[model samples]
Target chain A: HHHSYGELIREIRLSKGLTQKEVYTGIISRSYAIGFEKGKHEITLSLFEEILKRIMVPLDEFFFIYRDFSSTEDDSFWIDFVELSGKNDVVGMQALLDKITLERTEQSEVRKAILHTRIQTINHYLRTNVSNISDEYKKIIHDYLWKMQTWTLEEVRIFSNGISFFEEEVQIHFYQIMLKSYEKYRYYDRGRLLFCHLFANLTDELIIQNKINYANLVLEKLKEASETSGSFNSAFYRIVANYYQGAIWMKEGEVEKGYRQAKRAIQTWKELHYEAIADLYSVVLKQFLEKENIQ
Target chain B: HHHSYGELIREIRLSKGLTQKEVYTGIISRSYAIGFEKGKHEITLSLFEEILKRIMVPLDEFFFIYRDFSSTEDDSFWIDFVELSGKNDVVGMQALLDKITLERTEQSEVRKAILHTRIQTINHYLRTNVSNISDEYKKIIHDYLWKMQTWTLEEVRIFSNGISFFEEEVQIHFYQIMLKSYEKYRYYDRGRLLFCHLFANLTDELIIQNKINYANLVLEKLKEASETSGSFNSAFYRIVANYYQGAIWMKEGEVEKGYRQAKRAIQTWKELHYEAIADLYSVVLKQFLEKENIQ
Candidate 1:
């Protein structure tokens, strides 16, 4: 039988030799606690957090157990989506979209919209033009972004993924909203890393659209975000910023200097043993250089 | 004036354009939700989670805002402690202890015990022997470990930091408990890195006590744990395990092989641009080699 959240909490509480009274003392009434453990009563998040704190379980750890020790289905879907899209596997992307579409028969409207957003996002990036994503789907994403009071990791992912499909001004506006919304998490490792990623993606897209000035500004933001978070991974962000810097410089006609700067970034990635990432960026750099030669 | 948790929630809720009726419809009563927003009632954890889900706020983000966008004091204390202890700065460690001891006047019993544990851990690792930690403090830690149902990051840190002051068998026993308790988090990035650190520390301690066989076994566990998590950080753990393996080999009378193996680990660290870590491990390896020569 699948363990309910209440059951798991009870198991952990009992294992720690805590009495029901001890776990629920100031948080909830004894009767309510009992009902909660039996899965008859739904507890508030605050009370649940207090109970978990009393029982010494981190929220993430509790959720990990609640999920039966695996990433959520959505998480795995995104992982697969990113991998397939990264390799530019059109067949694989279509297969993933078809699989999720089939599964959407029993899902909610909101879930269905999200699924469509994922498919549209993949389509947007892959440039296959196989299907025309509806305006309704775009509005769903936009409405969701504006209606959510606080942007969680999921919200961040949704916004970042669908960003390219939006107008340039709307994209920048949402990016600013994210910066303010996630201000509390700015110093956090995850927050810093996400911002780095958001900035990198925005800069890359701006460059693709030949919006050199805006890309230059976002690259500066990327550099600042990466430097603020001091960790081994921070170096990767700095190198990426460097690569984008070179791209901007090249677009401004400093081809020789830009080429050297970009080459240095790839070399650094190679030295760090990130050969796959290096190769990926190197291909982009080579393509840009070829375009420059033709121009 | 400081914003209470409820107030923060309300702020976020309103910003997202959500009505109390919309947020509290199914999960809580209208009156209770009003009281919660007004700081008149404490809500349960489950309810809080549901409400956050409705408002799209992550737990970490909520806490971050609650704390006014800074790390908790205890977190900063531990970070300082680790840096001081890493550099073997006895004066700095004592200064840290003094600072916390002064602050302990208003802290809870559990907080007091954790503070003492930190002091004792520092003294033990530094070989200062200036203060005798009480049996009461030891019992407090022991009871905390057994009484806490789940091992969160804090509990893991408490146990790992104080593991050295315990008997070899007891240390190994606790290590096993951690491995099982954290199984759900094994694939998590933080969990994997933490286990790697725990294994390395335990192996180092066993080697210090001349328990080559146990060290060898733990080294294998470390290697396996590191490889199970595929990331750039995982490479650091593997290099650490390799260093420990070399130490074990040297203890078992394979001097030349051990010497080369250990050097390779240090070399890899340098190549990865972790110069400080490489330098720190190099000192340990050199000391081990010197001891081997004298014996």
Candidate 2:
């Protein structure tokens, strides 16, 4: 029932002033291309890929504009949403959150539900301190950590994601305990990747709080994590890893060296389109420049 | 104490027949560059960065050639490890696992320890079924899940990552439990990002197992997850999302649409530098096309 993909293909083909035969030179037949654009027949994967290739459009580009009839036609909604999140526009987020769901089918429902939960979680953290998370979540924290033999990805995520909302003492205690758990699954790519970040995130916060000693301890632990893991899960992790180390150096009064490291982190984040976090670092750098003191 | 970074820089500069003045053209003083080449002084982060930029080298490129004074320079070890793991080359993994640590330090010890644990865990999974994962771990699983007041990013990762090693029945049980947890944390970005992949992964396997009904259920869940999350945590996740959807369509006898979807997933993965995964998909596609039957 969706016509966007086919319609867009036709539109692009015409805009480029290319005939069907020209676009279907290799992989697709001319007759098939005609039928496909008309939505008279379904297109094979090869045909779709080839036609897109001939027309010089990437698959993502096509999909970026391609709409499932079951979903909203506005592909740019999520882009705005991400930018809003980056800018910390609370009211903007709230408004978009409300009007976010446009599709009601089973698939859309699941996607919609997940998005809803994510936004709410982000909003909660943004709007309140760790001390204010619901008691229900707090009370169950220790119990979950205590019984860690067999947990699902969801449960693991819940406990881990919830840690940032817990009090500092609780956070430290949980991190210590989880350190042991992480050791047990040390080589598991997925486990190691996640644990590395959890530890690093903790380290990042500690550095900010100027808990120098504890931060160093955590950094040593993280250094161990990174070394053993060899590779991180993503480039983003690597960037943050550099940022954490930079912050640590700065805290140690090695100002120039630390600032350089932090600066690179900022640059990498910007390159990655992570505006908000990059801005946060920019602010830190500005403060450091103003202080102008170093060992 | 660390001559490696400077030595490499000097070596690279001379190899390229570049003068200190040329490399330091805009950002750094020639004096500083001279001091830096001789390892006579520490370089500021900015100077280091500018030198790399002017020399048309990336930070990672520099780091690739850079070495820690304490460690053997075998940076590509992990890349090989990952590729081996992808091929399910147990023998190769074991060989590398045994010889992996060319570096030893507090950091490397931690890293080495994790990889050791991972190889062991993977072995255990391969050698034993989920029912055999020790009663200690099993007994603790529910208690862990029960106390699920909150979770960390790492915990979420551990669970999601651990799911692959679970027995089919247990995998299903935990995934179902995770569904509930995901519903609660649906507003959390980390939760949603992980959940989207988890659901899609389940759907992918279901489609392969010929459990069309269950696959659809999970696909619906994934559809909602993808739609709501706006963007995923990584291009990797997005790639898998496409693969999952493609599989779903293929199972539904919409071969053209399904193949196109799956084909695009392959293309995206290739573009993302996931060559192994992309190749795997190609193999799967070839087999499917040869069989020419899904339903």
Docking level of model 2: incorrect
Candidate 2 regions with alpha-carbon error over 4 angstroms: A1-137, A146-156, A164-169, A184-186, A226-229, A270-277, A287-295, B1-295
DockQ of 1: 0.24
What docking grade does candidate 1 earn? acceptable
**lDDT digits (tens) for residues A1-295 of candidate 1:** 1235788889877766668876787778889888889898877665676677666566665765676766522135556766875676767766776776664422123334655665665567667655467788777677767645456565677787677667867776787778775565557655677778888988988888788888888888888777663454454677788899888888898877887878877876664456787999988987877866623
Q: After superposing candidate 1, which stretches have Cα over 4 Å from the reference?
A: A1-6, A18-47, A71-114, A117-131, A139-155, A206-216, A227-229, A232-279, A285-289, A292-295, B1-6, B18-44, B71-114, B117-136, B139-155, B203-295
Clashes within 3 Å, all models in order: 21, 38
Q: Score each candidate by Cα lDDT.
A: 0.69, 0.55
iRMS of every model, one decimal? 6.2, 25.8
Looking at model 1, residue A40 earns an lDDT score of: 87
lDDT minimum window of 10 residues, candidate 1 chain B: B103-112
Local error of candidate 2 at residue B212 (angstroms): 45
Cand. 1 Cα-lDDT = 0.69
The residue-by-residue lDDT of candidate 1 on B4-61, one tens digit each, is 5688888877765668877777888989888999998877666776677666556665
Q: Give the C-alpha miss distance for residue A171 in model 2, angstroms.
A: 3.1
Q: How much is the lDDT of residue A96 in candidate 2?
A: 63
Q: lDDT tens string, model 2, B169-256?
A: 7666656656665664454443555676667667766766778888888877776665453332342454566676676677677877
